[PDB]
Amino acid sequence: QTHNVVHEANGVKLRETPKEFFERQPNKGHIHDVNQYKQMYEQSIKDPQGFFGPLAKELLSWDHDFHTVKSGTLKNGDAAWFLGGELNASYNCVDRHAFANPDKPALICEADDEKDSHILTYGDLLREVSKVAGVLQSWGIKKGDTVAVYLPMNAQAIIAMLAIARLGAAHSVIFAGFSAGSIKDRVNDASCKALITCDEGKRGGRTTNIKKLCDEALVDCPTVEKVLVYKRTNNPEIHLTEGRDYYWDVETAKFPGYLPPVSVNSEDPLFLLYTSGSTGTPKGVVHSTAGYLLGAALSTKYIFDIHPEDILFTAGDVGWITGHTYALYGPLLLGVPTIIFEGTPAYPDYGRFWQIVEKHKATHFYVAPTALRLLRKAGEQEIAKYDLSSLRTLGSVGEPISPDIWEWYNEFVGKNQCHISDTYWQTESGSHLIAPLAGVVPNKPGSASYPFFGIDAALIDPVTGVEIEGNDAEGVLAIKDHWPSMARTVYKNHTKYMDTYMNPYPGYYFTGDGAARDHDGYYWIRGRV
Amino acid sequence: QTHNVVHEANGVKLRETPKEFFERQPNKGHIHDVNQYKQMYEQSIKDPQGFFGPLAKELLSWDHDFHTVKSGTLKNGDAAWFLGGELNASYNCVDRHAFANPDKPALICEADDEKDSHILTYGDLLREVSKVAGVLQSWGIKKGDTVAVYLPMNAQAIIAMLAIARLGAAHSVIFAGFSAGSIKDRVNDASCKALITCDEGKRGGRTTNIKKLCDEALVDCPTVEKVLVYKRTNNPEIHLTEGRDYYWDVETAKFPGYLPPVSVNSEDPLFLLYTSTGTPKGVVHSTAGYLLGAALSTKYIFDIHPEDILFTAGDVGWITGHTYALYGPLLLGVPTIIFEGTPAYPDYGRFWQIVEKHKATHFYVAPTALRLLRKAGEQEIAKYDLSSLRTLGSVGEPISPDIWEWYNEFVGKNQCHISDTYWQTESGSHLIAPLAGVVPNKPGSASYPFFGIDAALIDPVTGVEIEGNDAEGVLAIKDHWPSMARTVYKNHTKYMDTYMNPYPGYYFTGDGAARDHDGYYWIRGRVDDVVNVSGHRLSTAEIEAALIEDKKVSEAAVVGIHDDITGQAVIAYVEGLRKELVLQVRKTIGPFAAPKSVIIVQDLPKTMRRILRKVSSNNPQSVEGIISAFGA
Amino acid sequence: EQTHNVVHEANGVKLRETPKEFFERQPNKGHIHDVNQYKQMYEQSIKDPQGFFGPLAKELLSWDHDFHTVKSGTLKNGDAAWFLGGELNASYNCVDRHAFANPDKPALICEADDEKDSHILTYGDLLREVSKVAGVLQSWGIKKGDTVAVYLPMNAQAIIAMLAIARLGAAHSVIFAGFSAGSIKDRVNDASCKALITCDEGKRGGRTTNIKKLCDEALVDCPTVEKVLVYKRTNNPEIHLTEGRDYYWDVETAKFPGYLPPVSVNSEDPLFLLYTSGSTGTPKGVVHSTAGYLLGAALSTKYIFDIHPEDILFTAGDVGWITGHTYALYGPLLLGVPTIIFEGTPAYPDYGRFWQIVEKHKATHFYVAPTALRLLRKAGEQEIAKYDLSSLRTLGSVGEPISPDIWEWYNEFVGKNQCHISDTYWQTESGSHLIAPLAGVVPNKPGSASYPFFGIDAALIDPVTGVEIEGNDAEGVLAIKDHWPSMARTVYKNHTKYMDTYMNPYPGYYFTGDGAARDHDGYYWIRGRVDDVVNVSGHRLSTAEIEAALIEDKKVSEAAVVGIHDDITGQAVIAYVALKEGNSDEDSEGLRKELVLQVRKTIGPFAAPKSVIIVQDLPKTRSGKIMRRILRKVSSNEADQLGDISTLSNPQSVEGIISAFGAQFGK
Ligand SMILES: Nc1ncnc2c1ncn2[C@@H]1O[C@H](COP(=O)(O)OC2CC2)[C@@H](O)[C@H]1O
Ligand SMILES: Nc1ncnc2c1ncn2[C@@H]1O[C@H](COP(=O)(O)OC2CC2)[C@@H](O)[C@H]1O
Ligand SMILES: Nc1ncnc2c1ncn2[C@@H]1O[C@H](COP(=O)(O)OC2CC2)[C@@H](O)[C@H]1O
Numbered sequence A: 001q002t003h004n005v006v007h008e009a010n011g012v013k014l015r016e017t018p019k020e021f022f023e024r025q026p027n028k029g030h031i032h033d034v035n036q037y038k039q040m041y042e043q044s045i046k047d048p049q050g051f052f053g054p055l056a057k058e059l060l061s062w063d064h065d066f067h068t069v070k071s072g073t074l075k076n077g078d079a080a081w082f083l084g085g086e087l088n089a090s091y092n093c094v095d096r097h098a099f100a101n102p103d104k105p106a107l108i109c110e111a112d113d114e115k116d117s118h119i120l121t122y123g124d125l126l127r128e129v130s131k132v133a134g135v136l137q138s139w140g141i142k143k144g145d146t147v148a149v150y151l152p153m154n155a156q157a158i159i160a161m162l163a164i165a166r167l168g169a170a171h172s173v174i175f176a177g178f179s180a181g182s183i184k185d186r187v188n189d190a191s192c193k194a195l196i197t198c199d200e201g202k203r204g205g206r207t208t209n210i211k212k213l214c215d216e217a218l219v220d221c222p223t224v225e226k227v228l229v230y231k232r233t234n235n236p237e238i239h240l241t242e243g244r245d246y247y248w249d250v251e252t253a254k255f256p257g258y259l260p261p262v263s264v265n266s267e268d269p270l271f272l273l274y275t276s277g278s279t280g281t282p283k284g285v286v287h288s289t290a291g292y293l294l295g296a297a298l299s300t301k302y303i304f305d306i307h308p309e310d311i312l313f314t315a316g317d318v319g320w321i322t323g324h325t326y327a328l329y330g331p332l333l334l335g336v337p338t339i340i341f342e343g344t345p346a347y348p349d350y351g352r353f354w355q356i357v358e359k360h361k362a363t364h365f366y367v368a369p370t371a372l373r374l375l376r377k378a379g380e381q382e383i384a385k386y387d388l389s390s391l392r393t394l395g396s397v398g399e400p401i402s403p404d405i406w407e408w409y410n411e412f413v414g415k416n417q418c419h420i421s422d423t424y425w426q427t428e429s430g431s432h433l434i435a436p437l438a439g440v441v442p443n444k445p446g447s448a449s450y451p452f453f454g455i456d457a458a459l460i461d462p463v464t465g466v467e468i469e470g471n472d473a474e475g476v477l478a479i480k481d482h483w484p485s486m487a488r489t490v491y492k493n494h495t496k497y498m499d500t501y502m503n504p505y506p507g508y509y510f511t512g513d514g515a516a517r518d519h520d521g522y523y524w525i526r527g528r529v
Numbered sequence B: 001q002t003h004n005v006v007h008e009a010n011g012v013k014l015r016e017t018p019k020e021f022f023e024r025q026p027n028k029g030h031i032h033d034v035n036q037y038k039q040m041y042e043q044s045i046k047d048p049q050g051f052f053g054p055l056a057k058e059l060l061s062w063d064h065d066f067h068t069v070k071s072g073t074l075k076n077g078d079a080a081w082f083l084g085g086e087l088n089a090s091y092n093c094v095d096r097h098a099f100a101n102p103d104k105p106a107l108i109c110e111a112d113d114e115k116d117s118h119i120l121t122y123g124d125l126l127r128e129v130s131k132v133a134g135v136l137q138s139w140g141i142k143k144g145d146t147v148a149v150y151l152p153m154n155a156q157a158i159i160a161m162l163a164i165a166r167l168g169a170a171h172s173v174i175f176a177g178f179s180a181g182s183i184k185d186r187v188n189d190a191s192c193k194a195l196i197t198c199d200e201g202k203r204g205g206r207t208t209n210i211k212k213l214c215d216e217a218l219v220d221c222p223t224v225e226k227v228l229v230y231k232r233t234n235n236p237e238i239h240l241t242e243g244r245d246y247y248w249d250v251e252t253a254k255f256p257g258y259l260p261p262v263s264v265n266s267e268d269p270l271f272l273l274y275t276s277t278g279t280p281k282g283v284v285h286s287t288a289g290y291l292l293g294a295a296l297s298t299k300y301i302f303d304i305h306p307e308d309i310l311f312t313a314g315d316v317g318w319i320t321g322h323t324y325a326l327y328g329p330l331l332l333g334v335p336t337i338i339f340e341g342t343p344a345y346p347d348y349g350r351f352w353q354i355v356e357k358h359k360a361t362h363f364y365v366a367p368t369a370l371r372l373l374r375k376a377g378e379q380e381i382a383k384y385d386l387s388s389l390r391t392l393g394s395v396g397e398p399i400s401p402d403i404w405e406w407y408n409e410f411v412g413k414n415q416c417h418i419s420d421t422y423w424q425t426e427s428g429s430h431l432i433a434p435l436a437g438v439v440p441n442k443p444g445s446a447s448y449p450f451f452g453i454d455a456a457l458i459d460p461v462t463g464v465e466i467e468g469n470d471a472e473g474v475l476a477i478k479d480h481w482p483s484m485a486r487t488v489y490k491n492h493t494k495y496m497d498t499y500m501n502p503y504p505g506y507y508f509t510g511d512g513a514a515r516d517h518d519g520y521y522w523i524r525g526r527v528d529d530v531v532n533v534s535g536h537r538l539s540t541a542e543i544e545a546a547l548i549e550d551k552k553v554s555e556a557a558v559v560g561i562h563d564d565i566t567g568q569a570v571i572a573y574v575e576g577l578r579k580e581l582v583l584q585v586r587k588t589i590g591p592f593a594a595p596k597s598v599i600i601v602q603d604l605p606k607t608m609r610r611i612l613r614k615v616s617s618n619n620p621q622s623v624e625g626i627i628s629a630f631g632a
Numbered sequence C: 001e002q003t004h005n006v007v008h009e010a011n012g013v014k015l016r017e018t019p020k021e022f023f024e025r026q027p028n029k030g031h032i033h034d035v036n037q038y039k040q041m042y043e044q045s046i047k048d049p050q051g052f053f054g055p056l057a058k059e060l061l062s063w064d065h066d067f068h069t070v071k072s073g074t075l076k077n078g079d080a081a082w083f084l085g086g087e088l089n090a091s092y093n094c095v096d097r098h099a100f101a102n103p104d105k106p107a108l109i110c111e112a113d114d115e116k117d118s119h120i121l122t123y124g125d126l127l128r129e130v131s132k133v134a135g136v137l138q139s140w141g142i143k144k145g146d147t148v149a150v151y152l153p154m155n156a157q158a159i160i161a162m163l164a165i166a167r168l169g170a171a172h173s174v175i176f177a178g179f180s181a182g183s184i185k186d187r188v189n190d191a192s193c194k195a196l197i198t199c200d201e202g203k204r205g206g207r208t209t210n211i212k213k214l215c216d217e218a219l220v221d222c223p224t225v226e227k228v229l230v231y232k233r234t235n236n237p238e239i240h241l242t243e244g245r246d247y248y249w250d251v252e253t254a255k256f257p258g259y260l261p262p263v264s265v266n267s268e269d270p271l272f273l274l275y276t277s278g279s280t281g282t283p284k285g286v287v288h289s290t291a292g293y294l295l296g297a298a299l300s301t302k303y304i305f306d307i308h309p310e311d312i313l314f315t316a317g318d319v320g321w322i323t324g325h326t327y328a329l330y331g332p333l334l335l336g337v338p339t340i341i342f343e344g345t346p347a348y349p350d351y352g353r354f355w356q357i358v359e360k361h362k363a364t365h366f367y368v369a370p371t372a373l374r375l376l377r378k379a380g381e382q383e384i385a386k387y388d389l390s391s392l393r394t395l396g397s398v399g400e401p402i403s404p405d406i407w408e409w410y411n412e413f414v415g416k417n418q419c420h421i422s423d424t425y426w427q428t429e430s431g432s433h434l435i436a437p438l439a440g441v442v443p444n445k446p447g448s449a450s451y452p453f454f455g456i457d458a459a460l461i462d463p464v465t466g467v468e469i470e471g472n473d474a475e476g477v478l479a480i481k482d483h484w485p486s487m488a489r490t491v492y493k494n495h496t497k498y499m500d501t502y503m504n505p506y507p508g509y510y511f512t513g514d515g516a517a518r519d520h521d522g523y524y525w526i527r528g529r530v531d532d533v534v535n536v537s538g539h540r541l542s543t544a545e546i547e548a549a550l551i552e553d554k555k556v557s558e559a560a561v562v563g564i565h566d567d568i569t570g571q572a573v574i575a576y577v578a579l580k581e582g583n584s585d586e587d588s589e590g591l592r593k594e595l596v597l598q599v600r601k602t603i604g605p606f607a608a609p610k611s612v613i614i615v616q617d618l619p620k621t622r623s624g625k626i627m628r629r630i631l632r633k634v635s636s637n638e639a640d641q642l643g644d645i646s647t648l649s650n651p652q653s654v655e656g657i658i659s660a661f662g663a664q665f666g667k
């Protein structure tokens, strides 16, 4: 009953999902109980072919069928999924839903100031993505190119990512807060042929110099032929360099509201996302197309319990993986609306998140514990002003969630009527690795619980390098086989990838984190090592 | 029986298809009668998916299947057909027929002088297209490029077009009678990477300077990297620029007679065709939808069977040659007669001599040529055996009842069906036409709208559809159709403003028409160019006249431009006098007819409102003034 | 009849049935039941190519897109095409599919010049290395429609380079590692290659060969080559790499992952260029398509050699030549079996090396040229008894005639009279076997290639009348009456040369350049080239190219090169040279050596003349053109038979020619 190693697990009562979760659920859940989850999970570990093939055919639309579900090993860094298949990410995120229901909302955009907020339908999104992709195509962007994005969290960032993917090019999103030198490093490592940005940004009421930093960086980025500049503030004193910089509205007005998507192979790169590592300069994590999209759709459907009637609010930023997988690809693949918030949880007041959740009857909310701490400190009383009865799944990501913060989140935001998903994962995993499925897995505050489909998690003794048998254990967290959404390389530097992830413990994927596993199989993340 | 509006139709007896038509028809007709036509037409309007899906699979060969038959709306300018599909135009016009019957004639080429005439089979055409496509491929031409063609109406023009389409590039054919400036404008707007032309041309016995005008134009066309030059006259004095120009024969001899075609998407551009009042605009046509329209209209309106032979006396420099000298007939796998010369050379019987020589079953020509031959060569017609013909088409302009009767009697001997085909460059293929052997004729009427064409008459003042027959108004189309043009090259806003925004929810043909008690349409010609300001349609000419009535005004020019709020805005070029002129227009025309702004200028273009249009959107010397005052 | 009045080779020749031990060692039921089934299937392959080759193409190749038409075009119009509309990838069919099925199965059994450096790559290993090299090439801009040169010895890196280039839809052009810098230059420039794959140095017979050095020398004049990939075969640090152009195989492949998607190409997109010598002077890049070439390779390897999944093939060839292309690489790898890639010579460390390798790996199939058989019979017979060769059942011979005596020697000393011998007739332009005895099916006549293969409708044409010869006991020009899947499709950027060489000499036919005879049983007997092409030790040479090389020496005024029989190399090249101002018989030996070295450095060591004859002038017609017929007749000791020479402008010269050949051919 007691734990000698996993001290966090002693005297922790399981927390079943509240009845109101199932009352607010629009349809029968996707999994009935934990026993069915464990059957499906064991099948996903022992027979990835027969588990993931059918799901890949169910959740994604293919332009060419695949012939092999899974190939490669971790030790050889040659992982591949759905080999021979062809598809397009923008077709799966936009076109098919637009044909099905063009007036269904897609991007619920909340601007830094609410007066500028708007809503794009899937039909709208198809037209705007097509026009921007037509601009990029006229400029010579084609499959195999990279295109940089330097935009805030708003419709233009989503449209730019989808338009780049529509051509089979790989987008490289650069968080709008980066310095000119960070922009330069990333652009040059990726050899981007084009950049998409805006003139200025609005954050918490303040105006941010965006094009200015781009211009500073581009003096050292010779590969950038053309820049597309959105008029976010329309400030006339913002310089565009003749022959390089063009306005978003002016160029998109020249092209039609439909452009054919370009088919890419399952293993063609979908994007580069640059991350800081423990050794040296930024490294470009490369994600494939089919595997990443399947992981995004699968984790969004099963871990958050997303249905067609639902509305996801991922309070993240597309500059990071969270916005990639769960503000954009995850929800759009499933054809539900997603809320794109440009501002901050404090402007105009600390009720912004909640005013938004009420306004759009959001059903899912996904945020990092940092924001939870900020709102507990400075804006608790605001929560009661707004109706949050539409929610049933509350997500937490990025860092450990202390039991204190977990209980506060559960009571004040969830009104003790929602399910909480502590999702553990990382930029290189593509999608959730360990997380409690909504309406299925009972919670232990501070614990991410069970590994997800295709994630064969294990603990390794660092001193010896040997895998640790049995529960009530602690050690380095690692995965014993690759999974569909695993990152495939570091751009033009596969040796760094091998040394970072595959070579510390040959045969395993090294997460860089230490964790504990208790007598129930629940995992407790203990941070970086 | 009487018409109070459609005066053309009063006292007009229907003209049934003559029995000789069905005697000469090689097989059972494709449609039995008008009732079957109407059932099929109603399905093509109410259920485009169930009507055009099966036809697209029947008439075209696909590399990848389509998942959606029809997408988009006119209002949003995002029409698309057969989404997800892949195909190749040259495979559908050449390869499949060559594999089925390589010795069947494809291009029956009649040169300016008959001594130079020849016939290419489908196998011959496959080899020549493959070799030219190999030359272009070795030069770097690929999907997404544009390639200019400046060639007379002969085998090399057809081969060039098909070879460019074989690589998935888009051809832009430039009528060989165009000047150097016209070549330059079109090549630069399209940013063509290569050009295919010839040294000189032969027309009416005269030698025309083709390569010379090309050089003149190319001095200012930096995107053209290479030129392929056919030796039409083999004149040794014709200079080739080293490193840029290469000979057709020399380069094609280096490559094999088969080259794989490149699959393109249904909505990838097949061609740009530049149109000749203001600035030339590149009408862009898709691949799958355009080809389907070409095949469908050629088959059903002309009644084309595998045994038939089509003579379209047009020029690939224009949409008629594109669609009914090349794509339509070759798609159906029949021979097409490509005539390089004039109706008068060596004499005024040449058209009829060609029909007799090749036993053509179908003849398609513009009323302009019919009038010329009636005036100068009538007696020549009877000198030739024209009994192989059963379908006589007319295109491009109204055919008066009198010219229709002359055509019917002197060419058709009262034994052929006449198809007065109404359509335009932007429609891709026939919009309103009497189906051969099916629809009875009223001379001068185009008769019924074609498959997928939901035609209507619109009140020009209110934009509201006119219900019932015995009516007149603006001819408009209520939904897009497979072969509708998709954009204006790199200028989609001009496309929207020209076709979709004047009457939102409709396609604007620019023509007026009348509809009689039988549902037959009578084309009435161009309308008067209204500008749409927040739903009020204004006449630039009326505003100019009203401004001119003011005796202190010397000259007035009124133009329209795009406006994100009011759709269009009106700018007049001519502090207190400006207000006086605006009030003058308000009290002469109406309160809402006032220009958005009156700009007092001392100069205006003529040497031409086009300059004013471009100026308002941010004697050559005069130009400066226009700009200066607009800066005011 | 039983007697032959024309095909003398066939008189008194007893058929040689397949020995029973062949069937004892055969691992499964044969692919063909007996010779009658072979004849039924062959007739279908001629009368109904669509119904015969469609199903086989669907069985043996994996398609990304199905084909809609099996066969198109005619020889006369030079527009042959097969499996139109199809899409596939050669590296997927040679690697990926087998790696997915059995990643640990051996693929490349690599025997290095020194056995200590030997190793084995599995299909999984091969997939990873091919993917990495393809990743390097892709990052350099190589894409479908480009050509990439390979200048590598016969080892794993050559195979990997070829497959990596094909993985991107680019066409490889392999340049035999015995070529000089000028030959590399000619081929690289005619193809406009964007990149080159080579190595620092080579190992042959224990000697170190200069590979990268010759590449640098040639590349000074190859402006289209943007980047070079260099494998460290010896890792000699003194080997210079040019900054900005040359990069190391290991360094660059370490940057990319072990899987890269293959690029789908059309059946008729070019798979490779192989530069071949003819009666011209300039090498011609023979172009092979993808689907048809691969189908021919798989089909001939499977049916003529009787290859099964359990078998192991040792083709003692070099990828620098078509034999290595088709039967060391594409054929076996398509069929998913291991192939032995031998970097060395038959003589090093001793003359048992071939048999040591066969025994080491229990090879079931061995494929070699008669030149090597003659060498081993002369110098290494005593080695054979040291080795267990009982794993073998199919012994192939390629590239040149196999005399009845050599056939018997091969049959007895290597096969122990228990193996089937496959004398395979074919050529670079045919892609795969044209006439050959199917192992276990066709009985042999020693010296005869036997029956034409599937899709090969062979004929004999009267050299006087140009008319096809009906009936048997006949002789004439060997021609083929319709194209076949693996037929070469063009000469790179010179289709007119292709037409003039192969399709126009005998309209409606393919001209092989060979003469042949057909006996009363329908067996074909190859009689050798009719077009004066010379084959020295399996290498096709251009007498005109050798003449040009000799003339480059400014001491030479005129040069005429001819071919003759040679007991060692099959044919030998004899060069006749007239000098400007020479004389002095003491300088003769030295100047002859100088000219031989000139040829060695212009073309390559293997193109050196057997002998250089210094004469005072060459025989010429009234029009001033050299009459090589006289030099041929003299060089074969047939001075009698020269006949009336009063038609020459300089009949007096003939005497000298004869005397000179008598004095100098020996010494
Ligand atoms: N639920 C969690 N509980 C405890 N720790 C967590 C949790 N989620 C993330 N982490 C830490 O963040 C890194 C990933 O950061 P990254 O920005 O790459 O991806 C971010 C996640 C989008 C992990 O390696 C780990 O140390
Ligand atoms: N049967 C017809 N009866 C009366 N008028 C006609 C008819 N066909 C065309 N037109 C006029 O020509 C324009 C199109 O010209 P375009 O050169 O683009 O297309 C050329 C015709 C292929 C129409 O809008 C219209 O005004
Ligand atoms: N079994 C054989 N019996 C007699 N002669 C043969 C045989 N195989 C080839 N040849 C001669 O080689 C030329 C082609 O040589 P190539 O190097 O192109 O291809 C060689 C095959 C690799 C043939 O035209 C012919 O003259």
Ligand code: NA
Pocket (backbone or CB within 6 Å): none
């Ligand atoms: Na494809």
Ligand code: NA
Pocket (backbone or CB within 6 Å): A064, B063, B064, C064, C065
């Ligand atoms: Na496909």
